[PDB]
């Protein structure tokens, strides 16, 4: 998945 933590 596309980076989603920030």
């Amino acid at each position, epitope marked *: *998945p*596309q*980076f*989603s*933590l*920030w």
Partner: single-chain antibody
Amino acid sequence: DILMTQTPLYLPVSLGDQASISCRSSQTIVHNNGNTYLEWYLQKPGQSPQLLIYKVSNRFSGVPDRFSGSGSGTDFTLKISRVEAEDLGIYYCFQGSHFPPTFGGGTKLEIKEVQLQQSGPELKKPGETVKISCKATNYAFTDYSMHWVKQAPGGDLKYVGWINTETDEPTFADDFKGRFAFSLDTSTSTAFLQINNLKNEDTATYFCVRDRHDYGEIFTYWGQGTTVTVSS
């Protein structure tokens, strides 16, 4: 913004001995989702960093149990029960919980299918421009974002940013706002980092990196790196 203070800067050791390395964050690194994204990397001489421990204490696949990570709050530690020849190199702690992610300054330890292929070393005069490429192999390119990390001459690691491979939207760490640009070419499964007006402070090895954040890992696959030498 979050300082990772890593000690010691140097750790001379004899094989067979124990080694402990510590890292203190200037702020807590628990993520609002409950996870603590503290990772430890080992960079062997002449190689890219490799992930050893993620989420504080979990050993990356294939990493020997001689390595254990512990800690909480603002203090973390990597312990090596018995140092072996293949453990020599530079260790870095890293926090990926709060943007921008940050790396500890490194600890030099010394005796007393996914693949990312980058373009070659470039020797450039200042004021010029360079376009570094990173080709992804063995996973679907647009399924994961592409991250970029800068490793200065003295070895310190700095996060540059990431590009969403589906929306083509980039995000930069404050220190790289302006002369850096990310772009991509899906026909060649390639991500690029372009640097305008080459300056002395740009000399470094730039790494493209793939995360597996949905597995709890931040920097799992690193390219071999691309050295940009600005010979003024």
